[PDB]
Design a protein around this ligand. Structure first.
Ligand code: MG
Ligand code: MG
Length: 296
């Protein structure tokens, strides 16, 4: 059992060992396109690249973006994990959103973190100042935003200027989750995860949700791992049936480095264990998460 195992690892103080074993067993696949000279300025970090086999290809001369399709066959959910767009890849980012028919973007970082710019300002901050990405012929307008205590939800309108088709994109922006560390509480993380779920952005009738932090592997991996684990129990109505480490290693077949610290691994256990309360039919813990969240 996941809860049994968690208590064993915690009392033996074994999280670093457990996490290091995951790194040693992780898949290794070529990243030849990411490493082409013409793509150097499309990568935020030299050591975080998409595998060729799972990378998202842009439809419109150079198809390269630092983004990976994580396709969880058994859970029947997909995610696109990507780096925080650079100043020259914001048009590529929204082209990917458009071509993949994604309905939601989950942003787990702030634009400035730790004294440095971790992400370009790739969405409009003011309704009256829309953004046009001339390289990809897309227009992006801020329609509304709901600013909560530690996260913000925005409605964006993304228009294809060629066809004049428009789509609503929901932006879920986590405000106080730093890299390397674990979120303040499972409650606030789960409250946020369930807001994304409730929006319909994860439905299979849409493209995969787009998830990013700065590198698109640490906080982003934690988000997807918890969501996939909860979905697997939901499908089986069986929390015992879920092996978190097996699921993480499966995710790492599609993008390198998912979950960057032993603390993030331990938090994933905490989050899935607490989230299981809701999956198995205690719908009122979701209310307690919102209370514990102090989102107002
Ligand atoms: Mg429009
Ligand atoms: Mg169209």
């Amino acid at each position: 059992e996941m809860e049994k195992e968690f208590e064993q690892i915690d009392k033996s103080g074994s999280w670093a060992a457990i996490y290091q074993d995951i790194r040693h067993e992780a898949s290794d696949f070529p990243c030849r396109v990411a490493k082409l000279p013409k793509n150097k300025n499309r990568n935020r970090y030299r050591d975080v690249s998409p595998f060729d086999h799972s990378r998202i290809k842009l439809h419109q001369d150079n198809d390269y973006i630092n983004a990976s399709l994580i396709k969880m066959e058994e859970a029947q959910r997909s995610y696109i994990l990507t780096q925080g767009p650079l100043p020259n890849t914001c048009g590529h980012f929204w082209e990917m959103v458009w071509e993949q028919k994604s309905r939601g973007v989950v942003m787990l970082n702030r634009v400035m973190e730790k004294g440095s710019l971790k992400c370009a300002q790739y969405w409009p901050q003011k309704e009256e100042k829309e953004m046009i990405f001339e390289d990809t012929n897309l227009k992006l307008t801020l329609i509304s935003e709901d600013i909560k205590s530690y996260y913000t939800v925005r409605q964006l309108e993304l228009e294809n200027l060629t066809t004049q088709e428009t789509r609503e994109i929901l932006h879920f922006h986590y405000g106080n989750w730093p890299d390397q560390t674990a979120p303040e509480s499972p409650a606030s993380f789960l409250n946020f995860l369930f807001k994304v779920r409730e929006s319909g952005s994860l439905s299979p009738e849409h493209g995969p949700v787009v998830v990013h932090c700065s590198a698109g592997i640490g906080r982003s991996g934690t988000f997807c791992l918890a969501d996939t684990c909860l979905l697997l129990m939901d499908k089986r109505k069986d929390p015992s049936s879920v092996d978190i480490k097996k699921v993480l290693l499966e995710m790492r077949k599609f993008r390198m480095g998912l979950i960057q610290t032993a603390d993030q691994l331990r938090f994933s256990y905490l989050a899935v264990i607490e989230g299981a309360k809701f999956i198995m039919g205690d719908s009122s813990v979701q209310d307690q998460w919102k209370e514990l969240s102090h989102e107002d």
